[PDB]
Design a protein around this ligand. Structure first.
Ligand SMILES: Nc1nc2c(ncn2[C@@H]2O[C@H](COP(=O)(O)O)[C@@H](O)[C@H]2O)c(=O)[nH]1
Length: 359
């Protein structure tokens, strides 16, 4: 492209300098990046969304965001709190009579949401592939740790929280999310189930062997890791987490997702969101998002006292996402890739970009 005008956005060189080495190094087919600064959204797009169509990534491209979905699930849950349909200290079996008689008689909704129920695993056992088998699994589950004592990052945990939260509101999760929560968040290009009308915008994910893949149906996938969104919509969510929204209940729910419950090292666990004192060292940010924190059980420590950075990683077999933002500084970043590349790479690059945005 020698002789073409270079893009005019003065933030382009900052983003490029961090993102282009990322795409080359881990051979990422496409990434949509969106950045907030001084009340304005800046979109930077790289590569291709679908190798069959050759279509370039844009801020309208739909990516799987994996566990970033948990921030939306948690917001739905907080929304049920605000509406009075549940409290975080409710026993889980209050909201599901099929749970009465089990350990979930003594486990709170809050503990489900914050992966501190007592050692629920990261994933369902593979044989748990139906709603009936799911119910059986929960009723027979044996607590490993006492409730509240340990964080074990778990899809069955926040998955069940999302599920009972929607049950408290007398609506199935996916319609509730798409019809009430997401439109209130201004997220009109975000889906649990991507409709016919929007499929052409849906990227393919790409495995380590460069095979085109999309997320597999699994139990409570909708609740735990099943959202598809664009970088523009996700930046609207960042903005909603900073400036707020017009729906009064949704506004409260957003604030509730920021409230800390406990900490692990420098990370403080909120509802969905994980938070850090800002400015935050790269090492601290990497530690909070490390294999140790993600994969193994960690003891719960006292939460950080209520400036702050909020963040969440998301991954599926073919996608890698990350979002971080600092409300006190009006800055944020959304990075959505159609390849599941290392979390450490995501944090380092976001780290770097946010630091230059902070000025
Ligand atoms: N070893 C292992 N890693 C997982 C499993 N599920 C997700 N991960 C990884 O854990 C990290 C965090 O997931 P995320 O929070 O980004 O969805 C990602 O690197 C993701 O690929 C799993 O079942 N086993």
């Amino acid at each position: 492209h020698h002789g073409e005008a270079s893009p005019v956005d003065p933030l382009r060189p900052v983003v490029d300098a961090s993102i282009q080495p990322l795409l080359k190094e881990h051979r990422i087919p496409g990434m949509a990046v969106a950045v907030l600064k001084d009340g304005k959204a800046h979109y930077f797009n790289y590569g291709v969304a679908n190798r069959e169509s050759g279509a370039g990534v844009s801020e309208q491209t739909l990516f799987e965001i994996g566990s970033v979905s948990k921030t939306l699930t948690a917001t739905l849950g907080a929304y049920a709190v605000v509406k009075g349909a549940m409290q975080l200290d409710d026993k889980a079996s209050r909201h599901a009579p099929w749970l009465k008689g089990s350990a979930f008689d003594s486990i709170t909704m809050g503990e489900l949401a914050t992966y501190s129920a007592g050692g629920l695993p990261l994933q369902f056992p593979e044989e748990v592939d139906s709603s009936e088998k799911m119910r059986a699994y929960y009723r027979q589950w044996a607590p490993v740790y006492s409730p509240g004592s340990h964080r074990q990052y778990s899809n069955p945990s926040i998955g069940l929280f999302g599920h009972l939260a929607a049950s408290s509101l007398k609506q199935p999760f996916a319609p509730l999310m798409e019809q009430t929560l997401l439109p209130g968040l201004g997220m009109h290009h975000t889906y649990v189930n991507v409709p016919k009308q929007a499929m052409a915008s849906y990227a393919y994910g790409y495995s380590k062997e460069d095979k085109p893949i999309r997320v597999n149906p699994g139990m409570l996938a909708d609740e735990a890791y099943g959202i598809k969104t664009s970088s523009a919509d996700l930046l609207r969510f960042v903005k909603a987490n900073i400036g707020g929204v017009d729906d009064k209940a949704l506004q409260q729910a957003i604030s509730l997702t920021h409230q800390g419950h406990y900490s692990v090292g420098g990370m403080t666990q909120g509802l969905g969101w994980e938070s850090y004192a800002y400015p935050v060292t790269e090492q601290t940010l990497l530690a909070g998002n490390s294999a140790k924190v993600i994969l193994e059980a960690n003891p719960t420590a006292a939460p950080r006292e209520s400036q702050v950075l909020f963040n969440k990683t998301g991954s599926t077999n073919g996608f890698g996402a990350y979002v971080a933002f600092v409300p006190a500084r009006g800055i944020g970043i959304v990075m959505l890739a159609n390849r599941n590349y290392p979390i450490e790479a995501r944090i380092k690059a976001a780290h770097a970009i946010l630091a230059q945005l902070a000025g």
